[model samples]
Target: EKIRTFAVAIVGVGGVGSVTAEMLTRCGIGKLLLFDYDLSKVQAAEHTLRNINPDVLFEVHNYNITTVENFQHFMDRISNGGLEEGKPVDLVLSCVDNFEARMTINTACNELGQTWMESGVSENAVSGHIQLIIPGESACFACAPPLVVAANAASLPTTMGVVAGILVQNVLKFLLNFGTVSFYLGYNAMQDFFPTMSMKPNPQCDDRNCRKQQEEYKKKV
Candidate 1:
């Protein structure tokens, strides 16, 4: 068997996460850890991966089992009570529908010192963002979107597809170590003036939360 080069753990196998998994598999990522609360979604992701790479090792779990307690249990088992045991995960992609799940996964990634790409979509507008936090460098998710508002409305199927596809592209770029990744803000297809704007991080982003999380992550690692 060919040795795998990189591994990605994707949370939420819905519109965005599912497509991201497919993109990652097609991009020839070595292994995939997929989590979804829905059985149907788990099956969908498995099917997609099989089509892309039959050799890819996939570990699928229920997202509901991603609670703080269960996550810690998983860590203890996977890491064998040590914080740095077992194979290190390359990156994590979060496409959860709610903020709570996103926050949970973000905290876990920060604690694990792993790169994370977060993406979301609603109606015609979508957000595709990535945060690269390597212990002493870069900012964490809590520092980026400190204040998050709940999704006001649901999106059409087509809108979801477009946002998912774009977000997956961002994940692929990050994985391949190529292209200029951006924290993008844009409107997809429902407005006359659909535009995208990209920029540097907010100055206020040097928040205490980010620093605190990094410190905690360092201690754990």
Candidate 2:
């Protein structure tokens, strides 16, 4: 992969997040930033990832980033972006289970003109979806209302494998700048269906910041 030197930020290092980090680490990622509310999860994720590629630089944080007090620190840490000016990690992967956290990540990324992707699985474990978010470029997480379950319901082993695999594949494609980057891709094992679609920024989006990004994108284009 051509993504050997790109910095990646991963939020919620559990379930799919844990395995996704391992996949990226094995890909020879140069820099990685990991965050989770639980310390053990963060440590375990770090340990597993380090075993895959000990040469990579990994920074781990323990906190529930959606909290206002915690996110105050979060904002400060990401203020300069990432290792580069104005570019906070080359990409941000949201493997979180809650809409609040997803929207929180979206809101921050928009403020910084950052790009990120989101992944979710249905409660029945039969279906899952991944959506890409390009700040100032595409529809944001808040642009449309998502059909979320009462909780991130259970999932089969195969469903987990498929969702995690595609998420990393798209990240690799994006970092390498080759192949098509699906703005949105969905998978359902029950009927063995794969659906893909693109979405435009909602002019009347509930998020004022996302609207601002759309306006900036149009002006720049």
Candidate 3:
């Protein structure tokens, strides 16, 4: 069998996550595992899958699943318990709406030493962020998103789609090992009409969590 190129774990198949999945499938990502709590979201994804790539087998799951024990049970089923494990997932794309959901997925990816991309948009503005947490190689999300005040509301569909498009492109570049400089992209469709890019980590990111992970890796090694 020819070796697969990449696999992605996308959590929360909402407006953002669903579009992200569409972009990923169109980009020809080898395997995609999708998660969401809403049946409607899954149905939306199924519709997109049919149009985009019918051959692509993207597994969808509900995130309302309680308990770490239960969560692991379903996760194992989706990932085949690393048994039929092909290449480990190259990246995790977080399009979850709530802060807690984002944090949970980020923590799991960090523990697994997976590179993850954090992307979100709210109101008219959009924020696209990516971090490579490759066990001593880059920063983790906790260090980056510390002390985020809860937003009063989420973004419109156009803004959300714009951010997701940019994020999915970043994932493609990362997977191809293209050496494209990682950066954040912001947009305001109502004003600028085009997105702006910045090559800087979030200022609030102190990298404390990343340092902790590095220390733990050192101890284990």
Candidate 4:
């Protein structure tokens, strides 16, 4: 009664998430729940992901992410763990651009006790980072929320491809538990250096759930 199906949700659908979706489909992940902030973007994304991997199941939700109600409704559904026959979403890839959305996803995952990955690219569009989150095991998005994005952040698939590749790599490692699950990683295109850092949950964070996870981490350690 373990892993009858491998399912994941991609929260934002920019170039990074888009490429990651394609990779998951190529791996033939059992199911995919896809959502995007822009309705028109979903059309292109669903079409591309579906067309590339016809066997991969995709459920596309068309909604504006800025609407709190819309976002809340989606989070509530995933939080309820009804996506894959009473199974919670195994993972959520946060390719969002702003702080509020990342915080929202982080809080929802914390409440649902879900694991997720976060990705960000610098404003000039040359640097990026990917992070692994295991609710009580690692620092969350809110623990150290990312800064604002560039006007052209995450648009180029050329640089984004590298970020997306590593993003998916971490997903595979976590799911299989075979490799070192990097808690956090960063890319600096300026110097072509990648930094690995540790993130501990912020104790003074206003969110109770994040603080709660830190407590759980404390108990485990």
Best by TM-score: 2
Q: Which residue pairs of candidate 4 clash? A: 123-150
Rank order (by lDDT, best first): 2, 4, 3, 1
- Clashes in each model (backbone N, CA, C under 3 Å)? 0, 2, 1, 1
Q: In model 3, where is the ten-residue run with the lowest total lDDT? A: 194-203
Give candidate 2 misplaced runs (Cα > 4 Å).
79-87, 147-155
Q: Would you list the C-alpha lDDT of every candidate in the order shown? A: 0.59, 0.80, 0.61, 0.75
The digit string of per-residue lDDT tens for model 4 on 114-147 reads 8888887755667888988777667777666654
Q: Which segments of candidate 3 are over 4 A away from where they belong? A: 1-4, 74-87, 124-135, 146-155, 179-183, 188-212, 216-221
Q: Over the full model, what C-alpha lDDT does candidate 2 score relative to the true structure?
A: 0.80
Off by over 4 Å in 1: 1-4, 63-66, 73-85, 123-139, 144-155, 184-188, 192-209, 213-221
Model 3 Cα lDDT, one tens digit per residue, 1-221: 11135678788787688788888777666667777775467766867775787655565666563457646643453345221374456667778778867766655654555567777766445433333445345445565543333232344766777777778777877777665735444554545444333332332444444555676666785
Model 3 C-alpha RMSD to native: 5.3
How would you encode candidate 2's per-residue C-alpha lDDT over 90-145 as one tens digit per residue?
Answer: 88899888888888888888777878889876556787878899876788988888
